[PDB]
């Protein structure tokens, strides 16, 4: 279909380019420029690890890998089978079903792990060994927000494109 | 081996689009990667503020550079290049299988004008002109009353800012003339 042939794969390269040429160096000094107002040794390590259990760019790297395997699998699978309708139709509809699942799953993780799509300048931390409560300051909170909003919006569009192609087939029956 | 990638998009082009638009495109790409990248390398490492307050440097840098210049140019290049990529993908595949091509083409050059005009507008409003300053005064929390902070390489960043803006302004003028020739023919 026009949407599947063009728009899906165009937006996919769109996400890859944003990740590799632009975003990857916004997050370069994420822990080098974390600053905490304390004299306690080790407070910076625990407080950074508490508020960033996994970095944003590495979630996107994982997400891109997962949503590309169903495309990569269906190509290899048919090639081997043809080396030696319902089957091909079943594989196609299933493949676009998994892609919707993966995109939905990862957008969910972003929301609940990071409490929204906006990054704060100041984080308050009280995990051991830090004393009562310590102020720590994030590096480049505004730029990281801009790319987060960009990446989420593109993913949301990809979900909408997939469901239309899915609806396009079920009505065809 | 980007010759084969460009060669396909080199065709399916008009007189000045086949030559002038594309050469200016590699012109901007080369400057971004070859030269301008090593200028903005230490934008935060060499930001210096005259204070003893922890965390004042982070908020002051983030307040005056909400998004770096190079990553605005990186985004701008990606956006204006997609209409070319779509035209090559959409048309060639159907050519494998006048007005339709005319409608798609004149539409594509309409989006390229919009993106470049939009991004130039952002540069003006966000950074208040095209000249970067040596000194910035910052009073966001947690900084005490008002703090002096100093920018790294202000003069070299101004030169490349002017250079990229001027080239973008030319690309707009080339696109507008391309529109006129197609429009006058009707």
Curated annotation (Swiss-Prot), chain A:
Compartment(s) of residence: Cell membrane; Cell junction, Gap junction
Disulfide feature: 36-136, 43-130, 47-125
Name used for this protein in its record: Gap junction beta-2 protein
Alphabetized GO MF terms: calcium ion binding; gap junction channel activity; gap junction channel activity involved in cell communication by electrical coupling; identical protein binding
Extracellular side, ranges: 24-56, 113-145
Membrane topology: Multi-pass membrane protein
Residues that coordinate or bind Ca(2+): 25, 28, 30
Transmembrane portions of the chain: 4-23, 57-77, 92-112, 146-166
Top-rank lineage group of the source organism: Eukaryota
An individual GO BP term: gap junction-mediated intercellular transport
Similarity comment: Belongs to the connexin family. Beta-type (group I) subfamily.
Effect the entry attributes to changing residue 27 to S: In DFNA3A; does not affect protein trafficking; affects the ability to form functional channels; dominant negative effect
Effect annotated for changing residue 33 to N: In KIDAD and HID syndrome
InterPro entries: Connexin, Connexin26, Connexin_CCC, Connexin_CS, Connexin_N, Connexin_N_sf
Function (record text): Structural component of gap junctions. Gap junctions are dodecameric channels that connect the cytoplasm of adjoining cells. They are formed by the docking of two hexameric hemichannels, one from each cell membrane. Small molecules and ions diffuse from one cell to a neighboring cell via the central pore.
Keywords: Calcium, Cell junction, Cell membrane, Deafness, Disease variant, Disulfide bond, Ectodermal dysplasia, Gap junction, Hearing, Ichthyosis, Membrane, Metal-binding, Non-syndromic deafness, Palmoplantar keratoderma, Transmembrane, Transmembrane helix
Outcome of mutating residue 42 to A: In PPKDFN; impairs trafficking; localizes intracellularly closed to the nucleus; affects the ability to form functional channels; phenotype can be rescued by coexpression with wild-type protein
Subunit and partners: A hemichannel or connexon is composed of a hexamer of connexins. A functional gap junction is formed by the apposition of two hemichannels. Interacts with CNST. Forms heteromeric channels with GJB4.
UniProt-listed PROSITE patterns: CONNEXINS_1, CONNEXINS_2
Disease note: Deafness, autosomal recessive, 1A: A form of non-syndromic sensorineural hearing loss. Sensorineural deafness results from damage to the neural receptors of the inner ear, the nerve pathways to the brain, or the area of the brain that receives sound information.
Keyword Zinc among record annotations: no
GO (cellular component) term, any one: connexin complex
Keyword Transport (UniProt): no
Swiss-Prot record, chain B:
Topology relative to the membrane: Multi-pass membrane protein
Superkingdom field: Eukaryota
Substitution effect: residue 71 to W: In PPKDFN and DFNA3A; does not affect protein trafficking; affects the ability to form functional channels; dominant negative effect
GO biological-process terms attached to the record: cell-cell signaling; gap junction assembly; gap junction-mediated intercellular transport; sensory perception of sound; transmembrane transport
MF terms (GO), sorted A to Z: calcium ion binding; gap junction channel activity; gap junction channel activity involved in cell communication by electrical coupling; identical protein binding
SMART domains per record: CNX, Connexin_CCC
Effect of residue 55 to A: In PPKDFN; impairs trafficking; localizes intracellularly closed to the nucleus; affects the ability to form functional channels; phenotype can be rescued by coexpression with wild-type protein
Keywords, ordered alphabetically: Calcium, Cell junction, Cell membrane, Deafness, Disease variant, Disulfide bond, Ectodermal dysplasia, Gap junction, Hearing, Ichthyosis, Membrane, Metal-binding, Non-syndromic deafness, Palmoplantar keratoderma, Transmembrane, Transmembrane helix
InterPro entries: Connexin, Connexin26, Connexin_CCC, Connexin_CS, Connexin_N, Connexin_N_sf
Effect of residue 160 to L: In DFNB1A; uncertain significance
Entry-linked Pfam families: Connexin
Intramembrane segments: 1-9
Cytoplasmic face of the membrane: 10-16
Compartments, as annotated in UniProt: Cell membrane; Cell junction, Gap junction
Entry's Gene Ontology cellular component terms: connexin complex; endoplasmic reticulum-Golgi intermediate compartment; gap junction; plasma membrane
Binding positions (Ca(2+)): 38, 41, 43
Extracellular side: 37-69, 126-158
Effect of residue 137 to R: In a patient with congenital erythrokeratodermia; uncertain significance
Disulfide bonds: 49-149, 56-143, 60-138
General function of this protein: Structural component of gap junctions. Gap junctions are dodecameric channels that connect the cytoplasm of adjoining cells. They are formed by the docking of two hexameric hemichannels, one from each cell membrane. Small molecules and ions diffuse from one cell to a neighboring cell via the central pore.
Disease: Deafness, autosomal recessive, 1A: A form of non-syndromic sensorineural hearing loss. Sensorineural deafness results from damage to the neural receptors of the inner ear, the nerve pathways to the brain, or the area of the brain that receives sound information. Deafness, autosomal dominant, 3A: A form of non-syndromic sensorineural hearing loss. Sensorineural deafness results from damage to the neural receptors of the inner ear, the nerve pathways to the brain, or the area of the brain that receives sound information.
Self-association and partners: A hemichannel or connexon is composed of a hexamer of connexins. A functional gap junction is formed by the apposition of two hemichannels. Interacts with CNST. Forms heteromeric channels with GJB4.
Stated name of the protein: Gap junction beta-2 protein
Organism, scientific name: Homo sapiens
């Amino acid at each position: 279909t026009s949407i599947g042939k063009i728009w899906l794969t165009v937006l996919f390269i769109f996400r890859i380019m944003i990740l590799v040429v632009a975003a990857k160096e916004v997050w370069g000094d994420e822990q080098a420029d974390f600053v905490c107002n304390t004299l306690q040794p080790g407070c910076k390590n625990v407080c950074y690890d508490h508020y960033f259990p996994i970095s944003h760019i590495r979630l996107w790297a994982l997400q891109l890998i997962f949503v590309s395997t169903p495309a990569l699998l269906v190509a290899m699978h048919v090639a081997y089978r043809r080396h030696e309708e319902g089957s091909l139709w079943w594989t196609y509809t299933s493949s676009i079903f998994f892609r919707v699942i993966f995109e939905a799953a990862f957008m969910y993780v972003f929301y609940v792990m990071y409490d929204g799509f906006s990054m704060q300048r100041l984080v308050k931390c009280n995990a051991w060994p830090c004393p009562n409560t310590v102020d720590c300051f994030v590096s480049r909170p505004t730029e990281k927000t801009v790319f987060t909003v960009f990446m989420i919006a593109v993913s949301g569009i990809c979900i909408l494109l997939n469901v239309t192609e899915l609806c396009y087939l079920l009505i065809r029956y």
